[PDB]
Design brief:
- Two copies of one chain form a homodimer.
- By secondary structure, the first copy, chain A, is an alpha+beta fold.
- Chain A is built from twelve helices and 15 strands.
- Chain A has a single domain, classed as DD-peptidase/beta-lactamase superfamily (Beta-lactamase, 3-Layer(aba) Sandwich), CATH 3.40.710.
- In chain A, the strands form four sheets. In chain A, strands 2-1-15-14-13-10-9-8-12 form a nine-stranded antiparallel sheet, sandwiched between helices. Chain A has a two-stranded antiparallel ribbon with strand order 3-7.
- Chain A is globular, with a radius of gyration of 19 Å.
- The structure holds ligand OP0 (2 copies) and nickel (II) ion (2 copies).
- The site of one copy of the ligand *C(=O)N1C[C@H](NOS(=O)(=O)O)CC[C@H]1C(=O)NOCCN has 13 residues of chain B, from strand 14.
- Chains A, B: Keywords: Antibiotic resistance, Hydrolase, Periplasm, Signal.
- Chains A, B: Monomer.
- Chains A, B: It catalyses: a beta-lactam + H2O = a substituted beta-amino acid.
Chain lengths: 357, 357
C-alpha cells in the first residue's frame, strides 16, 4: 500500500500546508478494500491526533443522508416525488406549497428558497412553519436551481412526516443502522465526545456547529472517516443492505436535470468521469452555491452509475468535507478536515488521488 | 396438527405479502417429528408450486456445512483450530497468514478480511492465492470480528487441503451423504434442475447465483426445506450419525467469543433462549454484518447446548434463508424464500413460530 500512501501524501500535504489545516482524515475504498490516512491534529490545544475514528462535522454532505431517508419513504410507498409538499404537512395547505412538489424541494427548484433560513428563524417548529406559510417565490416551480438549506430541509422534514416520526428519530434508529453505521450521529453522544474534533474558523478560533432550524436535515451530521467510507461503500454496493435500504440508496442515484456539467440527484451531484479538474472545480464553485441557474431538465430520470463521479461538498464554520465515488470503477473517497478551506482545494486533493487510482 | 398450521400461517402469510415473496418453504422439527408448510410459487414464469422438495439457494447458511467439514477434519486429527493458516497451504508461507490461526479465519477475526472478495478476483486459484498473499490486516489478529466470505472461505478451503481433496469433492462425496442428505448440492445436477426455484431480485428480475471465488465455502449450497431440516435434526441429535460425524457436528456447537448478545461458533451463532425479538433482530442486523466489533473472548470454548438458540441467516440476490434450533427444547426450524427479504423479517417469522412452541 506504499504506492497508495505516496499518492495520498503527495496530494494531501501541500494542501494542508497551504490552507493551514490542523487535521485531515482520508479514507479510500479501492478494489473492495479500505485504506486510511490520518494527518495532523483533531485538537491543537490538547494535541489529540486524527485517526480514522475522529468525528468531524460534514456540513452539507448531510444532505446525502437526508436523501437516503426520503429514498426509504418512497420504497415504503409513504410519499412520491411528484407529491405536492402540503400533502404531507396540513399546516402548509393553502400556501404556495400546494403547488410545489417534493422533487422541487429536494433539488432546490421550488422558486428561490434562500441559501439559509432568515437569521430571525430560530430552531422552533412554529417559526419554521410560519416561514414556509408566508414564503413568496421569486420563480415558477421547477425552472431555477438555487442551492438551499430550507428547500432540502423541508424535503427531509416532509419525508419524516410521511413516515410518521421525527426526522432525528428516523435517522438515529432506522437510517444510520440500516447503512451499517454506528459512529454516525446528528448529536454526538456523551460517550463519543472525546472523539469529536475541534473546528478552526476563519480567525483560527476553536468552533463547533451551533443549533439552527432544520440543521439535522441540511448540515447536522458528525461522523468519522471510517464510518463515512462505510456509507460510500454502501452507495457503491447497495446490495450490502436489506432490500428497501438498497432501493433507498438507488433512489439517491437518479438524475433529474443538468446545470452546466453537473447532473442533480437527490443529495448527490454527478459528473462524467473522467472530467477535467477545472470543470469539476467549476461544478463545485461559489457561484454554483450562490447564483440561481436555469435547469436543463432530463426527459426521464437518469441512473447515476457507470463512468460517473458522484460527489458532495460540505462545510461548517470550522470544518470542510468532501466525498466522491465512481460507481463503474468501485472507487470511493472521503476527505474530512477541521478547517473550512476552499471547495476547489478539496477537489484538488480528490482529483489527484482519483486520477492515480 | 391444524394447531401448528394455524401458528405457521399467521407467522408467514403477512410477511410474504409485505415483502412480495413469491414462494416460501417452512420446515419445523417439533418433539422429533417433521412438519412442512409450502407457500406460493417456486417460479412465477411457469407457476411451479413450492413443495418441501423445492431447491432454494441458502447463501451464507452454507457456512454451517463448511464448518461441519472443518469439524470432520478436526476429528480426523488433520488440523487443529490453533494451527497457523499457512501450515495448510505452503503457498501462503511468508505472508501474514503465518500469524493468523484457523480459528481466526473461521470466526472472522483475522484482522479485517472484507465482506466479499474484490469484484476483480475471479474464481481462480492463482488470483485467490495472490489476493491472500497481498492482503494486509486492518486490525491485529483475534481482536475484531468483521463478517467475511474470504475469511471463512479460506477456513473451509484449508480444511479441504488438510484432508487432501478439493472442497467440492469432500462436500459431495463425504459430508452431505454422512448427514443423510441427498437433495443438497453445491452444483445442482441436471436430474434435479426441475426442482430449482427461480430467485427474484431487488428489482423483481429472475435471478440465480453465479460463480465466484470460494463460493462453495461461503454461500454456494442449494437445498430443500426437507433436506435442510434433516440437517437441523442431525444438529439436534449428533449421536444419530457415524461417530466421526457426530463429533464433527459437536465441533460446530462450541462458542469462542461474544459480541453483544451473540456467541460465535463455527458457522453457528448462538443466543440465550428465550430472548426478546428486538435483541435477536439486533444480533442478525446490518451493523452486525458490516461493522467491526471488539470481541469478548471466552476463557474456554463454551458448549452451545441447553436453553440456547443457534441460528444462521443467508441470502443471495434472489433468495433469503433462515435456520434455527433450540438444543434443550428439541426444536428445529427452516425458512427458505425465493426473494432476498430483510433479515429482521425472517427473524419475525421464526420468532413468531418458536414462541408458540
Ligand atoms: C453545506 O455545507 N452548506 C451549504 C452552502 N455551501 O454549499 S456547499 O459548498 O455545497 O457546501 C453554504 C455553507 C454550508 C452550510 O450551510 N453549512 O452549515 C453551517 C452554517 N449554516
Ligand atoms: C450470506 O448469505 N451473505 C453474507 C452477508 N450477509 O450476512 S448474513 O446476513 O449473515 O447473511 C452478505 C450477503 C450474503 C452473501 O454474500 N451472499 O452471496 C452472494 C454475494 N456474494
Ligand atoms: Ni461493484
Ligand atoms: Ni434431545
Amino acid at each position: 500500500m506504499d504506492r497508495l500512501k505516496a499518492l495520498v501524501d503527495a496530494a494531501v500535504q501541500p494542501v494542508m500546508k497551504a490552507n493551514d489545516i490542523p487535521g485531515l482524515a482520508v479514507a479510500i475504498s479501492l478494489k473492495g478494500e479500505p485504506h486510511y490516512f490520518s494527518y495532523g491534529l483533531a485538537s491543537k490545544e490538547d494535541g489529540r491526533r486524527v485517526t480514522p475514528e475522529t468525528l468531524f462535522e460534514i456540513g452539507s454532505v448531510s444532505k446525502t443522508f437526508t436523501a437516503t431517508l426520503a429514498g426509504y419513504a418512497l420504497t415504503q410507498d409513504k410519499m412520491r416525488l411528484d407529491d405536492r409538499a402540503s400533502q404531507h404537512w396540513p399546516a402548509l395547505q393553502g400556501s404556495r406549497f400546494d403547488g410545489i412538489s417534493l422533487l422541487d424541494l429536494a433539488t432546490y427548484t421550488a422558486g428561490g428558497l434562500p441559501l439559509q433560513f432568515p437569521d430571525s428563524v430560530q430552531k422552533d417548529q412554529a417559526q419554521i412553519r410560519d416561514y414556509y406559510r408566508q414564503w413568496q417565490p421569486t420563480y415558477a416551480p421547477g425552472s431555477q436551481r438555487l442551492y438551499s438549506n430550507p428547500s432540502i430541509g423541508l424535503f427531509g422534514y416532509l419525508a419524516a412526516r410521511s413516515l410518521g416520526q421525527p426526522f432525528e428519530r428516523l435517522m438515529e434508529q432506522q437510517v444510520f443502522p440500516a447503512l451499517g453505521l454506528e459512529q454516525t450521529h446528528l448529536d454526538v453522544p456523551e460517550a463519543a465526545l472525546a472523539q469529536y474534533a475541534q473546528g478552526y474558523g476563519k480567525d483560527d478560533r476553536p468552533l463547533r456547529v451551533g443549533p439552527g432550524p432544520l440543521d439535522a436535515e441540511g448540515y447536522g451530521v458528525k461522523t468519522s472517516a471510517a464510518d463515512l467510507l462505510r456509507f460510500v461503500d454502501a452507495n457503491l454496493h447497495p446490495e450490502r443492505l436489506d432490500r428497501p435500504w438498497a432501493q433507498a440508496l438507488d433512489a439517491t442515484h437518479r438524475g433529474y436535470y443538468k446545470v452546466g456539467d453537473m447532473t442533480q440527484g437527490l443529495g448527490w451531484e454527478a459528473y462524467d468521469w473522467p472530467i477535467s479538474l477545472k470543470r469539476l472545480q467549476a461544478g463545485n464553485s461559489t457561484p454554483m452555491a450562490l447564483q440561481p441557474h436555469r435547469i436543463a431538465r432530463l426527459p426521464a430520470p437518469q441512473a447515476l452509475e457507470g463512468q460517473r463521479l458522484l460527489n458532495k461538498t460540505g462545510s461548517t464554520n470550522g470544518f470542510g468535507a468532501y466525498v466522491a465515488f465512481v460507481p463503474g470503477r468501485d472507487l470511493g473517497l472521503v476527505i474530512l478536515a477541521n478547517r473550512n478551506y476552499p471547495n476547489a482545494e478539496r477537489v484538488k486533493i480528490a482529483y489527484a488521488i482519483l486520477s492515480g487510482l
